Symmetry: D2
Subunit: 297 residues, 4 copies
């Protein structure tokens, strides 16, 4: 079998304080995930503003997550993607030496590689490290789609590519993947449809919502894995509202905003071109939050 | 509190011979559905080439279904919709007059009414009969979408409107619908994702595939309704290839092609503008069919 | 080839209702207004004319009124006669010819999504049924299907009657494609906001929603462009942008009928379900945009 | 101050994994000798994603030196989805002697319109040279709205227009109807003529790597209001304009340049790679229809 990283996972926000990553806060937030039943954390993914972080800042976040998760079952699945293969290989290698348990590698954004290019991109990445590699398909952001065929071919040709984080709002593709390759780990990258993905044999979530509600996302995931579909569906339905409003502006603007409103972070800072939401959206976010029980530290 | 028509349902093809409805074949095909565990049939829907049947033919097909199903538990959910409200109302009242147990009424195509018009459209239809009305949302065909809000208002405001056939490939909307209104009957109008819809609380399917494999579709649906999700998923996975190929060209072109190849209908005859599939797709359909056990008469 | 054509500035006529029936006296008045403002042809019972909700008889009546009202003028009648059932479309085609239409506009089959092959046979059957010009109509946003460039060109070349296409797809690339491979066909704009770009690329006319309200401006635009006075045609197209967009704030013809009502050109603002009156807000928006334009009287 | 007319989005030729610098200059010289008004080093067609910052600087400098003493201007690609990086790239381009910069909308991270606004304002405030916005939603996952383009044009003196690659002539009408002063630049070869005939003032072309003389003639005919001649060229070029997109740009253009003997090797940087054998043969076929100018 392949080595895998599954279960309830959080795409960690990266808190800033006067432009700099807030390291005490970051560690404090990770610890809060762990104490609320989360199985893995993802430093410096999309939700962690990877695009505007430096290479050094990636290292710092990965190291903090690794350190914090040390001596626990919680794994670190490090964001380590790029639209340049040489960069992506480099980032994977670095994540590996910093002690990450695996990497999440987003499909090349902006330059629209062909399916053949995608295949070689990921093959190079997978052959550069010996840790699990999770594909990440989010065509709304990247402008390309890793086809089911390409995903399956990568799973079958590269030993450490074990699955895909799917953020495409396409349940038909999920059926397709698991009908043809049942050894695949399909991971939900879309909070609103966590349950439908899990009930079709998906094996985890990489969640934005779990930043704010780690206990509910882990319970949902664990219920689903336990084949308690009733309880998992109940949680998924009650979370629908917040799962949508967290995208009323581009992620992670709403989640960071909500984290701040909840007193989980000290200051609401983004790195350009991300910025504070409109005062209207700030209100919409504050409105939905107050309808949920939020765990402190 | 509502009267409903749920479970495994077939969108019946309409067989032609010499440019006419083959009335004997039609009755024979329906009997095959009855004997294979189907809970309801849908005469003159999209799969029955409703657009190209005359009024007298609409009648003929509904009567045959009504007469063939009499004395069995199998219901008739008649296709009766139009993009003109006075016509839709007329068809609704005719269907009831012919003895249909309920109606399936497609959102107005081509003229793109606003949500207010959709509401009034369906309110008028629902008030004209005293049998169950199921909404039918299929944006790719109609050019419009019944919003979740409109769907829920109609369900709550109109006594006989009891659910929606969703054919939009949007599992997010399905979560949305059942989270805000858990009492409605959400019916799958998309074969490949039957299981996901049912596993989220959907209560039936209106299937194209069941023309060919009524036993497998009824078993899938009944397993899911019995909360045997493992066996429902198993069947949905096996069906994925044929579910997919049955839409390689616009339905009902592939399903009729398959029915002809299976020897279930005499001729592969369509009414223009529908026609035989491409020879490439014909081959694909013929190949995919080999993997399944098709029931005869 | 060398075909019989119907081109120039054309209006997709609205169908005024009074008390749930077609207002026939009003229909005639609106057509006279188009004629006197330089319009080259009128299209009775198109999408803008709420074709979907008219009866076969009302469809007849509208064509007859258009035919009688244009009699003795240079203005031609290009009757809507589309359907998603080929036998019905053939019937509507013969219908229109019999009632004196100079040509037909035939929309691509909506809802049932025929293949390119089925589209070809659909139009071939229609073309062979009458001896008057046939204009194709591609509006994918409404029908759920697109007639490809290949299919349009094949139809143009194989069928004597088919002389062009009304394109409402917002895809200027396809227009380039069409006229690059088949420079003999009449490409007609069915998208008002972009009449000028279509005309400047060799398009030969428009079938306009906006001309219902501003027939003098649309006809001026078209003739400037047809005379290669492109700078003047552009000026008008830019001036018309505001109203061209607002007329689709809700589905055509809800906004145009509302505007005709607001201009005092029709007696009542009535639609047939599932179409209905616009929201109060869009009513206000239409009213405000209209104030920037000179609207010809009766 | 502006940069308009017929412009080329330069491909970046590789040799043994490195930028072939001699080949690069020779290509730019060929563009100059065929009537091109400006060249765009290291845009999307130049595989900007896969070049290091030093390679970026090198291409810009080679463009600047090669254009020295001619009327041809250098509009440098300097976009990024991180504002701190975009500003840095812009400032480097300026100190390398670029005449202006072409700055793509932040890709992947989907900024809000307010964020795009602050992003571009910061870029524009960082240099005193002209700045051309670049809208290509298909690649970035976001769109600079017409309102945002107009605000930025009006609020920042040196933001002078937008390269539009959205395949949406309606937006082009909207832009020039509400703000005619801006320079609308076609970023989509197949519809160069329609954009120019509506008041566009230039093209940033993929095709002109291969056929610089036809693209510049098209553009110049259009600017001279000779629409008949501009259309005729746009129509002739339609086949090549489409086939150059049968796979993601710049895969086809580089393949064609290779087949034409204009660059030495058909070499990309991953995740880009050679086209399929089918597309390769299709590209070869379409090329036979056009006269490809030499050096």
């Amino acid at each position: 079998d392949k080595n895998i990283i599954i279960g309830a996972m959080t795409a960690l926000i990266t808190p800033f304080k006067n432009g700099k990553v807030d390291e005490q806060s970051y560690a404090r937030l990770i610890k809060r995930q762990i104490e609320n039943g989360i199985d893995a954390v993802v430093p410096v993914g999309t939700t962690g503003e990877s695009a505007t972080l430096t290479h050094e800042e990636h290292r710092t976040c990965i190291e903090i997550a690794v350190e914090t998760c040390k001596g626990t079952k919680v794994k670190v699945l490090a964001g380590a993607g790029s639209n340049a293969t040489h960069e992506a290989v480099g980032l994977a290698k670095f994540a590996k030496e910093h002690g990450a348990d695996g990497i999440l590698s987003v499909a090349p954004f902006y330059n629209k590689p062909t399916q053949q290019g995608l295949y070689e991109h990921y093959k190079a990445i997978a052959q550069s490290v010996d840790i699990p590699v999770l594909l990440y398909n989010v065509p709304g952001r990247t402008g390309c789609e890793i086809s089911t065929d390409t995903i399956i071919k990568l799973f079958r040709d590269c030993e450490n590519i074990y699955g895909v984080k799917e953020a495409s709002g396409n349940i038909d593709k999920c059926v397709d993947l698991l009908a043809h390759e049942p050894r695949m780990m399909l991971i939900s990258g879309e909070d609103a449809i966590n349950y439908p993905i899990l009930s079709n044999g998906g094996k985890g979530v990489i969640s934005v919502t779990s930043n704010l509600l780690p206990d509910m996302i882990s319970a949902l995931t664990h219920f689903a894995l336990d084949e308690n579909y009733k309880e998992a569906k109940k949680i998924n339905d009650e979370l629908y509202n917040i799962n949508k409003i967290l995208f009323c502006e581009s992620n992670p603007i709403p989640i960071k905003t909500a984290m701040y409103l909840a007193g989980l972070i000290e200051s609401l800072e983004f790195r350009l071109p991300l910025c504070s939401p409109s005062k209207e959206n700030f209100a919409k976010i504050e409105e939905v939050m107050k309808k949920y029980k939020i765990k402190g530290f």
